[PDB]
Coordinates of C-alpha atoms and ligand atoms in Angstrom, one line a residue:
Chain V
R10 CA 1.6 10.8 0.0
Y11 CA 4.2 13.6 -0.1
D12 CA 4.2 17.3 -1.0
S13 CA 7.6 17.0 -2.4
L14 CA 10.2 14.3 -3.6
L15 CA 12.4 15.7 -0.7
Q16 CA 9.8 13.9 1.8
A17 CA 9.8 10.6 -0.1
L18 CA 12.9 9.7 1.9
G19 CA 13.9 7.1 4.4
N20 CA 11.8 4.5 5.6
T21 CA 13.6 2.2 3.6
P22 CA 13.0 -1.5 3.7
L23 CA 14.8 -4.4 5.3
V24 CA 15.1 -7.5 3.5
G25 CA 16.4 -10.8 4.8
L26 CA 19.2 -12.6 2.8
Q27 CA 18.2 -16.2 3.3
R28 CA 20.3 -17.5 0.6
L29 CA 23.5 -15.8 1.9
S30 CA 23.1 -16.1 5.6
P31 CA 25.6 -18.5 7.2
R32 CA 22.4 -20.1 8.6
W33 CA 18.9 -18.8 8.1
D34 CA 17.1 -21.4 10.3
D35 CA 17.3 -22.1 13.9
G36 CA 18.2 -26.0 13.7
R37 CA 19.6 -29.3 15.5
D38 CA 22.9 -27.8 14.2
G39 CA 22.6 -24.6 16.2
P40 CA 20.8 -21.1 16.4
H41 CA 20.4 -18.7 13.1
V42 CA 22.5 -16.4 11.9
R43 CA 21.1 -14.0 9.5
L44 CA 21.8 -11.2 7.3
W45 CA 19.4 -8.5 6.6
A46 CA 19.8 -6.0 4.0
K47 CA 18.6 -2.2 4.1
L48 CA 18.1 -0.9 0.6
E49 CA 19.1 2.8 1.0
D50 CA 19.0 3.2 -2.8
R51 CA 15.2 3.4 -2.3
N52 CA 15.7 7.2 -1.8
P53 CA 15.2 10.2 -3.8
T54 CA 18.5 10.2 -5.6
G55 CA 19.2 6.3 -5.1
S56 CA 21.7 6.7 -2.3
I57 CA 21.9 7.0 1.3
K58 CA 23.3 10.4 1.0
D59 CA 19.9 11.9 0.6
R60 CA 19.3 11.8 4.4
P61 CA 22.1 14.1 5.3
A62 CA 22.2 16.2 2.1
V63 CA 18.7 17.0 3.0
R64 CA 19.2 17.5 6.5
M65 CA 22.3 19.4 6.3
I66 CA 20.4 22.2 3.6
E67 CA 17.2 22.1 5.9
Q68 CA 19.7 22.8 8.8
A69 CA 21.6 25.8 7.2
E70 CA 18.3 27.3 6.1
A71 CA 16.9 27.0 9.6
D72 CA 20.0 28.6 10.8
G73 CA 19.8 31.3 8.2
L74 CA 23.0 30.5 6.8
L75 CA 21.2 29.9 3.5
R76 CA 19.3 32.3 1.7
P77 CA 17.9 32.4 -2.0
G78 CA 20.2 31.8 -4.8
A79 CA 23.3 31.3 -2.4
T80 CA 26.1 29.1 -4.0
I81 CA 26.8 25.9 -2.2
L82 CA 30.0 24.1 -2.2
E83 CA 30.8 20.4 -1.4
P84 CA 33.5 18.1 -1.6
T85 CA 32.1 14.8 -2.7
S86 CA 33.1 11.6 -4.8
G87 CA 29.4 11.5 -6.3
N88 CA 26.6 10.5 -4.1
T89 CA 26.3 13.4 -2.0
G90 CA 26.9 16.1 -4.9
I91 CA 24.0 14.3 -6.4
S92 CA 21.8 14.7 -3.3
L93 CA 22.8 18.2 -2.9
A94 CA 22.2 19.1 -6.5
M95 CA 18.7 17.7 -6.5
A96 CA 17.7 19.5 -3.2
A97 CA 19.6 22.6 -4.4
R98 CA 17.4 22.4 -7.8
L99 CA 14.2 22.4 -6.0
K100 CA 15.4 25.0 -3.5
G101 CA 16.8 27.8 -5.6
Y102 CA 20.6 27.0 -4.9
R103 CA 23.6 27.0 -7.4
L104 CA 25.8 23.7 -6.6
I105 CA 29.3 23.4 -7.2
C106 CA 31.0 19.9 -6.5
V107 CA 34.5 19.3 -6.1
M108 CA 35.1 15.7 -7.2
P109 CA 38.1 13.5 -7.8
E110 CA 38.7 13.0 -11.5
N111 CA 38.5 9.3 -11.3
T112 CA 34.8 9.2 -10.6
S113 CA 32.3 7.3 -13.0
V114 CA 30.9 9.0 -16.1
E115 CA 27.1 8.4 -14.7
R116 CA 28.0 10.6 -11.7
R117 CA 29.2 13.6 -14.1
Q118 CA 25.8 13.0 -16.2
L119 CA 23.5 13.1 -13.3
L120 CA 25.2 16.2 -11.7
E121 CA 25.2 18.1 -15.0
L122 CA 21.5 17.0 -15.4
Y123 CA 20.6 18.7 -12.0
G124 CA 22.5 21.9 -12.8
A125 CA 25.5 21.3 -11.0
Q126 CA 29.1 22.6 -11.8
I127 CA 31.7 20.2 -11.5
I128 CA 35.3 21.4 -10.7
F129 CA 37.8 18.1 -10.5
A130 CA 39.3 17.5 -3.0
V131 CA 38.4 18.4 0.6
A132 CA 41.8 20.5 0.8
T133 CA 40.4 22.2 -2.6
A134 CA 36.9 22.8 -1.7
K135 CA 38.3 24.2 1.8
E136 CA 40.4 26.9 0.0
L137 CA 37.7 27.7 -2.4
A138 CA 35.5 28.2 0.5
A139 CA 38.2 30.4 2.1
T140 CA 38.4 32.3 -1.2
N141 CA 34.7 33.2 -1.5
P142 CA 32.9 33.7 2.1
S143 CA 29.4 34.1 0.1
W144 CA 29.5 30.5 -0.7
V145 CA 28.3 27.8 2.0
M146 CA 30.2 24.8 2.5
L147 CA 27.8 22.4 4.2
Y148 CA 30.9 20.2 4.9
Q149 CA 29.4 16.6 5.2
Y150 CA 32.7 15.3 7.0
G151 CA 32.3 17.6 9.9
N152 CA 28.2 18.6 9.8
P153 CA 26.3 17.4 12.9
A154 CA 23.1 17.0 10.6
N155 CA 24.9 14.2 8.8
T156 CA 25.2 12.1 12.0
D157 CA 21.7 13.6 13.1
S158 CA 20.3 12.1 9.9
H159 CA 21.3 8.7 11.0
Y160 CA 20.7 8.8 14.7
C161 CA 17.2 10.4 13.9
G162 CA 16.5 8.4 10.8
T163 CA 18.3 5.0 9.8
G164 CA 18.8 4.0 13.4
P165 CA 15.2 3.8 14.8
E166 CA 13.9 2.5 11.4
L167 CA 16.5 -0.5 11.9
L168 CA 15.6 -1.0 15.1
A169 CA 11.9 -0.9 14.5
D170 CA 12.2 -3.4 11.8
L171 CA 14.7 -5.5 13.6
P172 CA 14.7 -5.3 17.2
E173 CA 16.3 -8.4 17.6
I174 CA 19.6 -6.8 16.2
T175 CA 22.9 -8.1 17.1
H176 CA 25.3 -6.5 14.7
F177 CA 25.2 -3.4 12.4
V178 CA 27.5 -3.4 9.3
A179 CA 28.2 -0.1 7.0
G180 CA 30.8 1.5 5.0
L181 CA 32.8 4.2 6.7
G182 CA 33.5 7.3 4.8
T183 CA 32.5 10.7 6.3
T184 CA 31.4 8.3 9.0
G185 CA 28.0 9.9 9.5
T186 CA 26.1 6.7 9.1
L187 CA 28.1 4.7 11.4
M188 CA 28.5 7.3 13.9
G189 CA 24.8 8.2 14.1
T190 CA 23.4 4.6 13.6
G191 CA 26.0 3.3 15.7
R192 CA 25.4 5.9 18.7
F193 CA 21.5 5.5 18.5
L194 CA 22.0 1.5 18.3
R195 CA 24.6 1.6 21.0
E196 CA 22.3 3.9 23.2
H197 CA 19.3 1.6 22.8
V198 CA 20.5 -2.0 22.3
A199 CA 22.5 -3.6 25.3
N200 CA 25.7 -5.1 23.6
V201 CA 25.3 -4.4 20.1
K202 CA 28.0 -4.8 17.5
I203 CA 29.1 -1.8 15.3
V204 CA 31.0 -2.9 12.3
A205 CA 32.9 -0.7 9.8
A206 CA 34.2 -1.4 6.4
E207 CA 36.8 0.6 4.7
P208 CA 38.7 0.5 1.3
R209 CA 42.3 -0.9 1.7
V210 CA 40.1 11.7 9.5
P211 CA 36.8 13.6 9.5
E212 CA 35.5 15.7 12.3
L213 CA 32.7 13.7 12.5
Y214 CA 34.5 10.4 13.7
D215 CA 34.0 9.1 17.1
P216 CA 36.8 6.6 18.3
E217 CA 34.5 5.4 20.7
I218 CA 31.6 4.1 18.4
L219 CA 33.0 1.2 16.4
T220 CA 33.4 -2.4 17.7
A221 CA 35.3 -3.6 14.8
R222 CA 36.7 -1.9 11.4
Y223 CA 37.4 -4.3 8.5
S224 CA 39.8 -3.3 5.7
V225 CA 38.4 -5.0 2.5
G226 CA 40.4 -4.7 -1.0
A227 CA 38.8 -3.6 -4.2
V228 CA 38.5 -7.2 -5.6
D229 CA 36.9 -8.9 -2.8
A230 CA 34.5 -5.9 -2.7
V231 CA 33.5 -6.2 -6.7
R232 CA 33.4 -10.1 -6.1
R233 CA 30.9 -9.8 -3.4
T234 CA 28.7 -7.4 -5.2
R235 CA 28.4 -9.9 -8.0
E236 CA 27.5 -12.6 -5.4
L237 CA 24.9 -10.7 -4.1
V238 CA 23.0 -10.1 -7.4
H239 CA 23.6 -13.7 -8.1
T240 CA 22.3 -14.9 -4.9
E241 CA 19.9 -12.2 -3.5
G242 CA 19.0 -10.3 -6.6
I243 CA 20.0 -7.2 -5.2
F244 CA 22.0 -4.7 -8.0
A245 CA 23.9 -3.3 -5.1
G246 CA 26.9 -0.6 -5.6
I247 CA 30.4 -1.6 -4.8
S248 CA 30.7 -0.2 -1.3
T249 CA 27.9 -3.0 -0.4
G250 CA 30.1 -5.6 -1.6
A251 CA 32.7 -4.9 0.8
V252 CA 30.0 -4.3 3.4
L253 CA 28.8 -7.8 2.6
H254 CA 32.3 -9.3 3.0
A255 CA 32.7 -8.1 6.5
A256 CA 29.2 -8.9 7.2
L257 CA 30.2 -12.5 6.1
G258 CA 33.4 -12.4 8.2
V259 CA 31.0 -11.8 11.4
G260 CA 28.7 -14.4 9.8
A261 CA 31.2 -17.1 9.9
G262 CA 32.1 -16.1 13.6
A263 CA 28.9 -16.1 15.0
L264 CA 28.5 -19.4 13.0
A265 CA 31.5 -20.6 14.4
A266 CA 30.8 -19.7 18.3
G267 CA 27.4 -21.2 18.0
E268 CA 25.8 -18.1 18.9
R269 CA 22.8 -16.4 17.4
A270 CA 23.4 -13.1 15.1
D271 CA 20.9 -10.7 13.3
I272 CA 23.4 -8.9 11.5
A273 CA 21.9 -5.7 9.7
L274 CA 24.0 -4.4 6.6
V275 CA 23.6 -1.2 4.4
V276 CA 23.1 -1.3 0.9
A277 CA 24.3 2.4 0.3
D278 CA 23.5 2.6 -3.5
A279 CA 22.4 0.6 -6.6
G280 CA 24.8 -0.5 -9.3
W281 CA 23.4 2.2 -11.9
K282 CA 26.6 4.7 -11.3
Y283 CA 29.2 1.9 -11.6
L284 CA 28.5 0.1 -15.1
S285 CA 30.7 2.4 -16.8
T286 CA 33.6 0.6 -14.8
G287 CA 32.7 -3.0 -16.0
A288 CA 32.7 -4.2 -12.8
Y289 CA 29.2 -6.0 -13.7
Chain E
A151 CA 9.1 -2.9 7.2
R152 CA 10.7 -6.3 7.3
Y153 CA 10.6 -8.7 4.2
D154 CA 12.4 -12.0 4.2
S155 CA 13.2 -11.9 0.4
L156 CA 13.7 -9.1 -2.4
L157 CA 10.4 -10.4 -3.9
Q158 CA 8.3 -9.3 -1.2
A159 CA 9.9 -5.8 -1.1
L160 CA 7.6 -4.8 -4.0
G161 CA 5.1 -2.0 -4.5
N162 CA 3.6 -0.1 -2.1
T163 CA 5.4 2.8 -4.1
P164 CA 5.3 6.4 -2.9
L165 CA 2.8 9.0 -4.4
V166 CA 4.2 12.4 -4.4
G167 CA 2.5 15.6 -5.2
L168 CA 4.1 17.5 -7.8
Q169 CA 3.6 21.2 -6.9
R170 CA 5.7 23.3 -9.1
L171 CA 4.7 21.3 -12.3
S172 CA 0.8 20.9 -11.6
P173 CA -1.0 23.5 -13.7
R174 CA -2.4 24.8 -10.4
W175 CA -1.6 23.2 -7.1
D176 CA -3.4 25.5 -4.8
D177 CA -7.2 25.2 -4.6
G178 CA -7.8 28.9 -4.7
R179 CA -9.6 31.8 -6.4
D180 CA -8.9 31.8 -9.7
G181 CA -10.3 28.3 -10.1
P182 CA -10.2 24.8 -8.3
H183 CA -7.1 22.9 -8.2
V184 CA -5.3 20.9 -11.1
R185 CA -2.9 18.5 -9.6
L186 CA -0.3 15.9 -10.7
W187 CA 0.4 13.1 -8.6
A188 CA 3.2 10.9 -9.2
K189 CA 3.5 7.0 -8.7
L190 CA 7.0 6.0 -8.1
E191 CA 7.3 2.5 -9.5
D192 CA 11.2 3.0 -9.6
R193 CA 11.0 2.3 -6.0
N194 CA 10.8 -1.4 -6.8
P195 CA 13.0 -4.5 -6.8
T196 CA 14.7 -4.0 -10.2
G197 CA 14.0 -0.2 -10.4
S198 CA 10.8 -0.8 -12.5
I199 CA 7.0 -1.3 -12.4
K200 CA 7.5 -4.7 -14.2
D201 CA 8.7 -6.1 -10.9
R202 CA 5.0 -6.5 -10.4
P203 CA 3.6 -8.5 -13.3
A204 CA 6.8 -10.1 -13.7
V205 CA 6.7 -11.8 -10.2
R206 CA 3.0 -12.5 -10.2
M207 CA 3.4 -14.2 -13.5
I208 CA 6.1 -16.3 -12.5
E209 CA 4.3 -17.1 -9.0
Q210 CA 0.7 -17.9 -11.1
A211 CA 2.9 -20.1 -13.5
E212 CA 4.2 -21.9 -10.3
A213 CA 0.7 -22.5 -9.0
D214 CA -0.6 -23.7 -12.1
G215 CA 2.1 -26.4 -12.3
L216 CA 3.6 -24.8 -15.5
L217 CA 6.9 -23.9 -13.9
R218 CA 9.4 -26.3 -12.0
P219 CA 13.1 -25.9 -10.8
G220 CA 15.6 -26.0 -13.5
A221 CA 13.0 -24.7 -16.1
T222 CA 14.0 -22.2 -18.6
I223 CA 11.8 -19.2 -19.0
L224 CA 11.2 -17.5 -22.4
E225 CA 10.3 -14.0 -22.9
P226 CA 10.1 -11.2 -25.3
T227 CA 10.8 -7.8 -23.8
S228 CA 12.2 -4.3 -24.5
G229 CA 14.3 -4.5 -21.0
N230 CA 12.3 -4.0 -17.8
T231 CA 10.3 -7.2 -17.8
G232 CA 13.5 -9.4 -18.8
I233 CA 15.5 -7.6 -16.2
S234 CA 12.8 -8.2 -13.6
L235 CA 12.4 -12.1 -14.6
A236 CA 16.0 -12.2 -14.5
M237 CA 15.9 -11.1 -10.9
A238 CA 13.1 -13.7 -10.0
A239 CA 14.9 -16.3 -11.9
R240 CA 18.0 -16.1 -9.7
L241 CA 16.0 -16.5 -6.6
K242 CA 13.7 -19.2 -7.6
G243 CA 16.5 -21.1 -9.6
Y244 CA 15.3 -20.8 -13.2
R245 CA 17.1 -20.0 -16.4
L246 CA 16.1 -17.0 -18.6
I247 CA 16.1 -16.5 -22.4
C248 CA 15.5 -13.0 -23.4
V249 CA 14.4 -11.7 -26.8
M250 CA 15.3 -8.1 -26.8
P251 CA 15.6 -5.4 -30.0
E252 CA 19.0 -4.6 -30.9
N253 CA 18.5 -1.1 -30.8
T254 CA 17.9 -0.9 -26.7
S255 CA 19.9 1.1 -24.3
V256 CA 23.7 -0.4 -23.5
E257 CA 22.8 -0.4 -19.7
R258 CA 19.8 -2.8 -20.2
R259 CA 22.0 -5.6 -21.9
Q260 CA 24.8 -4.8 -19.3
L261 CA 22.0 -5.6 -16.5
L262 CA 20.6 -8.4 -18.3
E263 CA 23.9 -10.2 -18.7
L264 CA 24.6 -9.5 -15.1
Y265 CA 21.9 -11.5 -13.9
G266 CA 23.0 -14.2 -16.4
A267 CA 20.0 -14.2 -18.9
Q268 CA 20.6 -15.4 -22.5
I269 CA 19.7 -12.2 -24.7
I270 CA 18.7 -12.9 -28.3
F271 CA 18.8 -9.4 -30.2
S272 CA 16.0 -9.5 -32.4
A273 CA 16.3 -7.0 -35.4
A274 CA 15.1 -3.4 -35.0
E275 CA 13.2 -3.5 -38.1
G276 CA 9.8 -4.2 -36.6
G277 CA 10.3 -3.5 -32.8
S278 CA 8.2 -5.5 -30.6
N279 CA 6.2 -7.1 -33.3
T280 CA 9.8 -8.4 -34.4
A281 CA 10.8 -9.4 -30.9
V282 CA 7.5 -11.2 -30.1
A283 CA 7.4 -13.1 -33.4
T284 CA 10.9 -14.2 -32.6
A285 CA 10.1 -15.3 -29.3
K286 CA 7.2 -17.2 -30.6
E287 CA 9.3 -19.0 -33.1
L288 CA 11.5 -20.0 -30.4
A289 CA 8.7 -20.9 -28.2
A290 CA 8.3 -23.4 -30.9
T291 CA 11.6 -25.2 -31.5
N292 CA 11.6 -26.0 -27.7
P293 CA 8.4 -26.4 -25.9
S294 CA 10.2 -27.2 -22.7
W295 CA 10.7 -23.6 -22.4
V296 CA 8.1 -21.6 -20.5
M297 CA 6.9 -18.6 -22.4
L298 CA 5.0 -16.3 -19.6
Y299 CA 3.9 -13.9 -22.4
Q300 CA 3.5 -10.4 -20.7
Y301 CA 1.3 -9.4 -23.6
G302 CA -1.4 -11.9 -22.7
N303 CA -1.1 -13.2 -19.4
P304 CA -3.8 -11.7 -17.1
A305 CA -1.4 -12.2 -14.2
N306 CA 0.0 -9.2 -15.7
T307 CA -3.2 -7.4 -15.5
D308 CA -3.9 -8.9 -12.1
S309 CA -0.8 -7.6 -10.5
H310 CA -2.1 -4.0 -10.8
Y311 CA -5.7 -4.9 -10.2
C312 CA -4.5 -6.1 -6.8
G313 CA -1.7 -4.0 -6.2
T314 CA -1.1 -0.5 -8.2
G315 CA -4.9 0.2 -8.1
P316 CA -5.8 -0.3 -4.3
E317 CA -2.4 1.6 -3.5
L318 CA -3.7 4.5 -5.5
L319 CA -7.0 4.8 -4.3
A320 CA -5.9 4.6 -0.6
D321 CA -3.2 7.2 -1.2
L322 CA -5.4 9.7 -3.7
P323 CA -9.1 8.9 -2.9
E324 CA -10.2 12.3 -4.5
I325 CA -8.6 10.9 -7.7
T326 CA -10.1 12.1 -11.3
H327 CA -7.6 11.0 -13.5
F328 CA -5.2 8.2 -14.0
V329 CA -2.4 8.3 -16.6
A330 CA 0.2 5.6 -17.7
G331 CA 1.7 4.3 -20.8
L332 CA 0.1 1.7 -22.9
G333 CA 2.3 -1.3 -23.9
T334 CA 1.5 -4.8 -22.8
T335 CA -1.7 -2.7 -21.5
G336 CA -1.9 -4.6 -17.8
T337 CA -1.3 -1.4 -16.1
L338 CA -4.0 0.5 -17.7
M339 CA -6.2 -2.4 -17.9
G340 CA -5.4 -3.7 -14.1
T341 CA -5.3 -0.2 -12.5
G342 CA -8.3 1.0 -14.9
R343 CA -10.5 -1.9 -13.7
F344 CA -10.0 -1.5 -10.2
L345 CA -10.5 2.3 -10.4
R346 CA -13.7 2.4 -12.2
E347 CA -15.1 -0.2 -9.8
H348 CA -14.7 2.1 -7.0
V349 CA -14.2 5.9 -8.3
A350 CA -17.5 7.2 -10.1
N351 CA -16.2 9.7 -12.8
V352 CA -12.7 8.4 -13.2
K353 CA -10.9 9.1 -16.4
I354 CA -8.6 6.5 -17.7
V355 CA -5.9 8.0 -20.1
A356 CA -3.2 6.1 -22.3
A357 CA 0.0 7.4 -23.5
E358 CA 1.7 5.6 -26.4
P359 CA 4.7 6.0 -28.9
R360 CA 3.9 8.2 -31.9
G361 CA 2.0 -3.7 -35.4
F362 CA -0.1 -6.0 -33.2
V363 CA -2.6 -5.4 -30.4
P364 CA -2.0 -7.3 -27.2
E365 CA -4.6 -9.9 -25.7
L366 CA -4.7 -8.1 -22.7
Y367 CA -6.2 -4.9 -24.1
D368 CA -9.9 -3.9 -23.3
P369 CA -10.4 -0.6 -24.8
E370 CA -13.6 -0.2 -22.9
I371 CA -11.2 0.4 -19.9
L372 CA -9.9 3.5 -21.5
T373 CA -11.2 7.1 -21.9
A374 CA -8.7 8.4 -24.2
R375 CA -5.3 7.7 -25.8
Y376 CA -2.6 10.2 -26.6
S377 CA 0.4 9.5 -29.3
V378 CA 3.4 11.1 -28.1
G379 CA 6.5 11.9 -29.9
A380 CA 10.1 11.2 -28.3
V381 CA 11.1 14.9 -28.7
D382 CA 8.1 15.7 -26.4
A383 CA 8.7 12.9 -24.2
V384 CA 12.5 13.5 -23.5
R385 CA 11.8 17.5 -23.3
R386 CA 9.0 16.4 -20.7
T387 CA 11.3 14.2 -18.8
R388 CA 14.0 16.6 -18.7
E389 CA 11.5 18.8 -17.3
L390 CA 10.4 16.5 -14.3
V391 CA 13.9 16.3 -13.1
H392 CA 14.6 20.3 -13.4
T393 CA 11.3 21.2 -11.6
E394 CA 10.4 18.2 -9.1
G395 CA 13.9 16.4 -9.0
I396 CA 12.6 13.1 -10.1
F397 CA 15.2 11.4 -12.3
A398 CA 12.7 9.3 -14.5
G399 CA 13.0 7.4 -17.5
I400 CA 11.7 8.8 -21.2
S401 CA 8.6 6.7 -20.8
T402 CA 7.6 8.8 -17.9
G403 CA 8.1 12.0 -20.0
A404 CA 5.2 11.1 -22.5
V405 CA 3.0 10.0 -19.5
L406 CA 3.9 13.7 -18.0
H407 CA 3.2 15.0 -21.6
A408 CA -0.3 13.2 -21.4
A409 CA -0.9 14.4 -18.1
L410 CA -0.3 18.2 -18.5
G411 CA -2.7 18.0 -21.7
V412 CA -5.2 16.6 -19.6
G413 CA -4.5 19.1 -16.9
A414 CA -4.3 22.1 -19.2
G415 CA -7.7 21.1 -20.1
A416 CA -9.4 20.9 -16.7
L417 CA -7.6 24.3 -15.8
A418 CA -9.4 26.0 -18.8
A419 CA -12.6 24.4 -18.3
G420 CA -12.4 25.5 -14.4
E421 CA -12.6 22.1 -13.2
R422 CA -11.2 20.4 -10.3
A423 CA -8.7 17.4 -11.2
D424 CA -6.5 15.0 -9.2
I425 CA -4.3 13.5 -12.0
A426 CA -2.1 10.4 -10.9
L427 CA 0.6 9.4 -13.3
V428 CA 2.9 6.5 -13.4
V429 CA 6.9 7.2 -13.4
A430 CA 7.5 3.4 -14.6
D431 CA 11.2 3.4 -14.4
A432 CA 14.1 6.1 -13.5
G433 CA 16.6 7.5 -15.8
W434 CA 19.6 5.3 -15.1
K435 CA 19.4 3.1 -17.9
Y436 CA 18.5 5.7 -20.4
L437 CA 21.8 8.2 -19.7
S438 CA 23.8 6.6 -22.7
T439 CA 21.2 7.4 -25.0
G440 CA 22.3 11.3 -24.8
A441 CA 18.7 12.3 -23.6
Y442 CA 19.7 14.1 -20.5
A443 CA 22.9 16.0 -21.9
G444 CA 21.9 19.3 -23.3
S445 CA 18.8 19.4 -25.7
Ligands
S16_559 O1 32.7 6.0 1.9 C1 32.2 5.7 0.4 N1 32.1 4.8 -0.2 C2 32.8 3.5 0.5 C3 33.4 2.6 -0.3 C4 33.8 1.7 0.0 C5 34.2 1.2 1.3 CL1 34.9 -0.2 2.0 C6 33.2 1.9 2.4 C7 32.7 3.1 1.8 N2 31.8 6.9 -0.2 C8 31.6 8.1 0.3 C9 32.3 8.6 1.5 C10 32.3 10.0 1.5 C11 31.6 11.0 0.8 C12 30.8 10.2 -0.5 C13 30.3 11.3 -1.3 O2 29.2 10.9 -1.8 O3 30.8 12.5 -1.5 C14 31.0 9.1 -0.8
S16_560 O1 5.4 0.2 -23.4 C1 6.4 0.5 -23.0 N1 7.0 1.7 -22.9 C2 6.6 3.0 -23.4 C3 7.4 3.8 -23.9 C4 6.5 5.2 -24.5 C5 5.2 5.4 -24.2 CL1 4.6 6.6 -24.8 C6 4.6 4.3 -23.7 C7 5.1 3.0 -23.2 N2 7.5 -0.5 -22.5 C8 7.2 -2.0 -22.6 C9 6.0 -2.6 -23.2 C10 6.0 -3.8 -23.1 C11 6.8 -4.6 -22.5 C12 8.2 -4.1 -22.1 C13 9.1 -4.7 -21.4 O2 9.8 -4.4 -20.5 O3 9.2 -5.9 -21.8 C14 8.1 -2.6 -21.8
PLP561 C1 28.7 7.8 1.9 C2 28.4 6.5 1.5 C3 29.1 5.3 2.3 C4 29.8 5.6 3.5 O1 28.7 6.4 4.5 P1 29.3 7.5 5.6 O2 28.1 7.7 6.1 O3 29.8 8.6 4.6 O4 30.2 6.9 6.3 C5 29.2 4.0 1.8 N1 28.7 3.9 0.6 C6 28.3 4.7 -0.2 C7 27.9 4.4 -1.7 C8 28.1 6.2 0.0 O5 27.4 7.1 -1.0
PLP562 C1 6.3 -1.6 -19.3 C2 6.3 -0.1 -19.2 C3 5.3 0.6 -19.7 C4 4.1 0.4 -20.2 O1 3.1 -0.4 -19.0 P1 2.3 -1.6 -19.5 O2 1.6 -2.0 -18.3 O3 3.4 -2.8 -20.3 O4 1.4 -1.0 -20.7 C5 5.7 2.2 -19.4 N1 7.0 2.6 -19.2 C6 7.9 1.8 -18.9 C7 9.3 2.3 -18.4 C8 7.6 0.2 -18.9 O5 8.6 -0.6 -18.5

């Protein structure tokens, strides 16, 4: 049990995708190639961003950067603003999110609910931070706590749950997830593969870490997100569909080469915020 | 840990102490503590507590020979159990006919359609009654459909007796009260039957909105029953998010409404309380209602 919602965070579960695995069972035909999904929507605000959000805030506090009633500013496409708005409400901070205007109405709603101001990005936010030195910009694209959250959280859990891992597949945005989990897995798992997925450069980016990076188009991502609810029951968000596409690429390849694989892939969020788009 | 299917990634939901909201979190010197504890059943396969009964029901139906691959399932529901059964039916390869009232939220037809269940939108005029009556009439045209019947299937109650309850006693052995909504009654009947078997003085408190009585209902399991209006349930729900950061469905506000009533009681009598309450779902599929906007 937890004294706070901020604690009921991480230790997200890992689910084998039996029906979507290129080959779930070792057989006459060749060794298994398994997709395992990690459900990061099982977090305080329903996305993986709770990890860095909280770790960044607890980090600014512990530094003494943050103080009662301080204004926090963050450029975000949704998920991180939501995680920061929830944490800021519990801690007595005022959040301002700078967002692109093409973000889903669900984001806006939940942010308003949590007491966040929304400006309608990194550049704008940077300029505002400079206009108002009072305000604190945690800066998820450069903040080491972002990467540490995954190095110290997502990584170890994955490894504890899937010690036989061969690939890790995730989305590449601020890059924290792939860098932190990537750096952890690479530092512990000989010959591990770290795969990115991008839509067709942050200070957190480390060129050394990725083994592959797939570019995935919008239509493939949507397609795959639907396939995932159809086949495995998981009401994933759009990013997860692109992640799944790349994972299946990597799956086809291991299956082609006669090699075993245990592909761990991230489900960064659920479909809830994406329904207004009509992609479901 | 590691699961081989989404159906196993079910339950063992977190219990989080609500310090800001509890009438008195700390056990000090104006009195003993009055402490609220929230069980987060949104941390479940389809973001609802119904995953528990929906899976057990199917699995019980399978063991008993009542279901076979290709079988169509029929069920009346207000959303949560429909969605849960739609998920399981993708994985076990069954078809799904839901009967849902027409005045339910937008995002629950969207989601139900997404898993590819048929939805017959029964009339708003008599709510659940109308939806259950409607499913029973349907169950009668085609008896090859298997209606699990959440309102009378002890596998509903069983899922909470074997899951929700044990989990709750483990995490909160000092428990004095349990507070959940009253619909099918499985949550209160199963969690209640378990807890009363193990915790001496335990209070089992229901919440309901201000028609029939489900077959599962045993009123000897209940201590008390609160009616809650939607205006109270909304304002309570908005309070939970603002003060604990939990984004729950409107049902949880009414449970919270009940729980605070209970808590305020213990507080004024000067007695200790450890009040567990179910957050049965998250706020996702309620945003379209406008309940989270600005009063
Ligand atoms: O990077 C993604 N999503 C994403 C989408 C598609 C693909 Cl292929 C990979 C990642 N989201 C993201 C990135 C950086 C910040 C935030 C944010 O919540 O502000 C979200
Ligand atoms: O009982 C509720 N919700 C509820 C709402 C308000 C209050 Cl106060 C108590 C319960 N929901 C319910 C009941 C029975 C079946 C289903 C279902 O998902 O099919 C849902
Ligand atoms: C942040 C995010 C990503 C990418 O993770 P990074 O750590 O930013 O690279 C992918 N999907 C969703 C839904 C996100 O919120
Ligand atoms: C089912 C449900 C309830 C009531 O639980 P029962 O065990 O059916 O009495 C309350 N709230 C929500 C959101 C539900 O889905």
